[PDB]
Amino acid sequence: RKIKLEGLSDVASISTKLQNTLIQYHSIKEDEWRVAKKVKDVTVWRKPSEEFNGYLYKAQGVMDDVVNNVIDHIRPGPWRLDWDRLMTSLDVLEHFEENCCVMRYTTAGQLDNIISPREFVDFSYTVGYEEGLLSCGVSVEWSETRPEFVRGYNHPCGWFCVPLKDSPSQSLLTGYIQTDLRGMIPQSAVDTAMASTLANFYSDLRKGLR
Q: State how far the alpha carbon of 174 is from the alpha carbons of 49, 70, 112, in Å.
A: 17, 11, 28
Q: State how far the alpha carbon of 159 is from the alpha carbons of 22, 134, 136, in Å.
A: 9, 6, 6
Q: Which domain holds residue 53?
A: 1-210
Are the C-beta atoms of 55 and 84 separated by less than 8 Å? no
Are the C-beta atoms of 199 and 84 separated by less than 8 Å? no
| Resolution value in angstroms | 2.0
* CA–CA dist 169, 173 (Å, integer): 13
- The experimental method, as deposited, was X-ray
Are the C-beta atoms of 55 and 32 separated by less than 8 Å? no
Domain count, the chain: 1
Q: Say which CATH number the domain at 190 has.
A: 3.30.530.20
Q: Is the dihedral of CA 188, 155, 197, 28 positive or negative?
A: negative
Bridge partners (DSSP) listed for residue 62 = 172
